[PDB]
Design a binder for this molecule. Sequence first.
Ligand code: HEM
Length: 398
Amino acid sequence: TRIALDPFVSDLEAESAALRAAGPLAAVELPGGVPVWAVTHHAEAKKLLTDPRLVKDINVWGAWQRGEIAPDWPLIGLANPGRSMLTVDGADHRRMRTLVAQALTPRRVEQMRERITKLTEELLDRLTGEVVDLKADFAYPLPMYVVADLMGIDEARLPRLGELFEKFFSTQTPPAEVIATLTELAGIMAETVAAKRAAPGDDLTSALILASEDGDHLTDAEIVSTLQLMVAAGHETTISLIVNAVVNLSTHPEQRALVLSGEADWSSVVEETLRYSTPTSHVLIRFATEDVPVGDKVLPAGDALIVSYGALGRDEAAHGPTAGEFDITRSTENRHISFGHGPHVCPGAALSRLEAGVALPALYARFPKLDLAVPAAELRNKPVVTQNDLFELPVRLG
Ligand code: HEM
């Protein structure tokens, strides 16, 4: 029995519970009428994520081979981006990933702690009034500035990039605007790369350009695709991580009391938010080169697989009978896999942990009484099916 993912994300908790119930391999419908499989249990996700029969090569997708995927499908930017580390495996994946991954180790991202701290304090300084949209005024700008600095993007481009990524991630973007959004994104990223080719810097775009002389030899198009990937994957997720941590503390007063009183550390808030309420509900997209058994089902060769990180985060087989609860003090035998698992594991994990690990204590140090300004049930997800993304975060600064 297929689960059609709600394009309007009207009850994400209920949909996640249905996906777990239908697992480990659930039949699902992506917005736009595209049928795929979703892995929704922790153990089977880890196996599929390291299974060499589950590849990123879209030429393996039967629906792609048959020409049944429209180029103006709103999800096309997520399902079929340009060639980058995201869309390859094997030796090509190593070549396309190594520079970025090594630039983002925990040791390397510490270099940015000062910039992240200064950005955080500057944003907190500008909060005005008793009630604010903390997403628009804080959680959204911080990771956009951070990834823009990382990648050498001109800060003057960030307002437009924000407008474009809103369309990129929405299920409701009309066909002409799907296409126009991807073309304009390509232009902004190409302009950034062209600028760094002329004057190479410490930013990661410059580093990729230099390595394409000096070893890795990514093509011009692959560098632009990698830049777009880094901005897409690095701002949207980190914003939701900060938003969801504030929501979770505001809906669990004992957990808020623990961390604000020093009985638990902020890292535990971040890690439990990642497990309980990941920024990334689903990851597109993998394809079976051969029939693959999953539980009592067979994933047929040529079919597609998404990984339902949101659903599997609350898998009771992984975390026990309290897996559906937000508990920053929990003991579990299984660490969460909200950054993925295997070769494609998020290279930005340390940077996101640093951003959230700086932003959250700074926020509550400035505003110890900070609370949602509305009952949490009134918060509304944007029509973004792969990301847990809220329209706004009304907050009383207290
Ligand atoms: C903030 C929380 C974040 C979460 C929850 C997250 C989640 C993930 C996950 C689950 C994957 C692997 C998907 C899969 O293979 O199934 C991934 C890949 C990736 N992420 Fe993150 N991410 C976050 C932040 C970031 C940041 C800050 C950056 C960049 C600075 C980034 C860049 C990437 C890239 C480039 C990939 C592709 C890696 C590959 O396929 O080799 N992410 N992310």
